[PDB]
Every structure is written in C-alpha cells, then in structure tokens.
Amino acid sequence: ENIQKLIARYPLVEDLVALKETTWFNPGATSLAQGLPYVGLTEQDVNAAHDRLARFAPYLAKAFPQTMIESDVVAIPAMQKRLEKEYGQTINGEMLLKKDSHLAISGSIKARGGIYEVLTHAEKLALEAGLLTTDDDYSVLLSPEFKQFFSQYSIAVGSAGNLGLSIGIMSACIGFKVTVHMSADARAWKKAKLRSHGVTVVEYEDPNCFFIDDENSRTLFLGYAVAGQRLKAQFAQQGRVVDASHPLFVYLPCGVGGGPGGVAFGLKLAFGDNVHCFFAEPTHSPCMLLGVYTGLHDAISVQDIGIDNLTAADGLAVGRASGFVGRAMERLLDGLYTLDDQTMYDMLGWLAQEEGIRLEPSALAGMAGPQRICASVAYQQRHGFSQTQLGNATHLVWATGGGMVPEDEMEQYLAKG
Numbered sequence: 001e002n003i004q005k006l007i008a009r010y011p012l013v014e015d016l017v018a019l020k021e022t023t024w025f026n027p028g029a030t031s032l033a034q035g036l037p038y039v040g041l042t043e044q045d046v047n048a049a050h051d052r053l054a055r056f057a058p059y060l061a062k063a064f065p066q067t068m069i070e071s072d073v074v075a076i077p078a079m080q081k082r083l084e085k086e087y088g089q090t091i092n093g094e095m096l097l098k099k100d101s102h103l104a105i106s107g108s109i110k111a112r113g114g115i116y117e118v119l120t121h122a123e124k125l126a127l128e129a130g131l132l133t134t135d136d137d138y139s140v141l142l143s144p145e146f147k148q149f150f151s152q153y154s155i156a157v158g159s160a161g162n163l164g165l166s167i168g169i170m171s172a173c174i175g176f177k178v179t180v181h182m183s184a185d186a187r188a189w190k191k192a193k194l195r196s197h198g199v200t201v202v203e204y205e206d207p208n209c210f211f212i213d214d215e216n217s218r219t220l221f222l223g224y225a226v227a228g229q230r231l232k233a234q235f236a237q238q239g240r241v242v243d244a245s246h247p248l249f250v251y252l253p254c255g256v257g258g259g260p261g262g263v264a265f266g267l268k269l270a271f272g273d274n275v276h277c278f279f280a281e282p283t284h285s286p287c288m289l290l291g292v293y294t295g296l297h298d299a300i301s302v303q304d305i306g307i308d309n310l311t312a313a314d315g316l317a318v319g320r321a322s323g324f325v326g327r328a329m330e331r332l333l334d335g336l337y338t339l340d341d342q343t344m345y346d347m348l349g350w351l352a353q354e355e356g357i358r359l360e361p362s363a364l365a366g367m368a369g370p371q372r373i374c375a376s377v378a379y380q381q382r383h384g385f386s387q388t389q390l391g392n393a394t395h396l397v398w399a400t401g402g403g404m405v406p407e408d409e410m411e412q413y414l415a416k417g
C-alpha cells in the first residue's frame, strides 16, 4: 500500500481511488498562443490533414456511398431540461450534440483518427512508389493494379473496439492485408463486421507490417483535429456565434486521449480562446485526469493507485494515458472530470427519451459536463465569465459512438436506468 504517499501531496487522488465523481478545473490553463508550442503540431499540419481528406474525397465517395467523414450537429433542448430536472443544476445557454456516433465507416470518433491513419499510410506508399501524385484523382486507388499494390503491404492492430473496427474496415477497402487481434470474449457482431470486409480477426483467450498505436501516433491526433474547422462551417451555416459574449464549452469523452485531444486542438485553432474544452472519463478509468492532475502523465496508471479499470464505457476503459497528449494539450484544457457508470447509463436512456438518439455508454461522458461547468463559481470566476455570457453560451456535448451498435446490444444498454 504505497499509494497513500501520492494521496498526501495530491488531495484529489483520494477521491479518484474512492471512485468519487470528481470535477477538476485546470488552474494552469491558458490561451491558444501560450498552449500552442507544447502541442508538437501546428495549424499547417492540420491544413495538410484537411487537404489530405479533400484528396481522398473522390475515393471515399465511391467506396462507401454513405459518405467527407463528418457528422451533423443538432440542438438537444429537451435533453437540456431533462438534465436540469434529474440533477437539479440549471444549464445556461443552448446545448448541442455532436453526433460523431453516426459517422460513416465505423459509427464512431475513430472514423476520424482511424481512417486518416490508414489513408495517410496508403497515400505515402503510393507516392513513394511513383504510382500517384497529389494532383491525381484519388479514385485511381480503387483499380485492380492499386489493390494489388496494397496487397503487397499489410496493417495490424490490437483492438476489440472502434479503433480496430475503423482501421480494419478502411485498411481492407484500400487493399492491405489486415489483421485485427482480439479476445474471444468480444462481441460476435464486431468480428462479423470486420470479416465481411475481408479482415482477418485472430482470436485469443516485420518490415512490411504497419502497427497503429493509439498511445503515440500524431497522425491519429491530427486526423481528429480536422473536426475543428468543419464544426466552424456548420456553426456558420446555422447562424451560431462563438465569441466572448457567446462562449463555446465543449465536453469530450476520453480513453487514451488522442480523440478528445486532437478534436480540442482543432477547435482551439478554429475558435481561439472562446472555445473551452473539457475531458470526460469513467471513475474506474481516470487516466488522463490522474495523469494531468499529478503531472506524472504516462508514468502513473489507474491500476497503481488501486482502480480496477473495469467499466461500461468499453471505449474509455484505458488505464494509462498517452503521455504526449497530456503534456501537449493540458494548457488548452479548461478542466477534466469523472462520472460513474450509472450516470452514463441513466443519461443514455434520457437522451433516447427526450431526443430519440441512441448512443453507447462511452458517448454519454460529455453529457455530464455542462451542469458541472455551470455549478462551479470557482471556474466561472477563474475565467472571468459573467452571468450574461454564460446565458449566451453554447454547451457542445461530443457523442463518440452508437450509430453502428446493433439492436440487441442497444437493448442491453437501455435496460440499466
């Protein structure tokens, strides 16, 4: 029992070990200009990513008719009032739902990171082999010659969820030999989804092979960051203002960190210091909260302090942070908070009731954020927020999965609240 030593210098570590619903507002959070140099990336890197996906748009158009891999944004005012009732706290401003749960390919946030990793790797090779240029129409990549080119290479991932689902599906559509290693206890539908695209799912109980790696890959991060500029266009189309007078609070589910980090960077680049991002994690897997708060990042894990890392949020069940995401983005995060499985399960049902939207438990992490921001007068005083500014604010909950989850599984999720 050497975890008691850390609990001395870091008071909040007591609540995390006790599985207490914690809400930590970052005192060392700052403007874009001051946060930027730590990120390791720049706007141009995102501009490249935007124009990468612009080049693959003709390819993806034909490949998956369901397609730009982008989700709608919708106001969820009935859900707002329901949260106000159940938990008490008033929610000032409009609440919006980002439905990355309904993205093409993998019905999840990974559709941004996963696909982009695959496409960028596939592009790189094609350019290096002298079979393609950046001025070519990327529909060429569907040809039998290019399928044969890609079959020469291979991709591999260890994931029982949306990472292996996204990489798996996209890698196969390109032409790669794809292999997703998985536990046999994983749900059969995901194995079936993968194998219908020609993926080799290996079940348990090399210079040619590219491994994904969510802990370090900047490519994934930059792929997520493409969401920022797209959201700005949606907001412009809907006559929605993001300003000092109209602040934008964003609530992002967090697993290892890549997803919400990349999105938060891209949003920061898009909307400046009037965007205010937050990470949401399960009480049983608070790795990014634990890593940022202590400053130990990837050095410390949730298992070390005695937390089991077991939770209904399968996508968020990550015991150790990415590390670089913590050091890179911490300054651009206004706060981090936890919520227990029952809170996710209950909100998941109320969202279905009030809005007719069905998500997986992990997606409901951001939903708790709004009332926790509105409750804290410490946070509002710390960031110089007036009461009128709060009233004209936009609270954007970021849903990260649900669209492809079959009925049987969704019926399982709904029977808990």
Ligand code: NA
Pocket: 254, 255, 256, 281, 282, 285, 286, 287, 288, 316, 317, 318, 319
């Ligand atoms: Na986590």
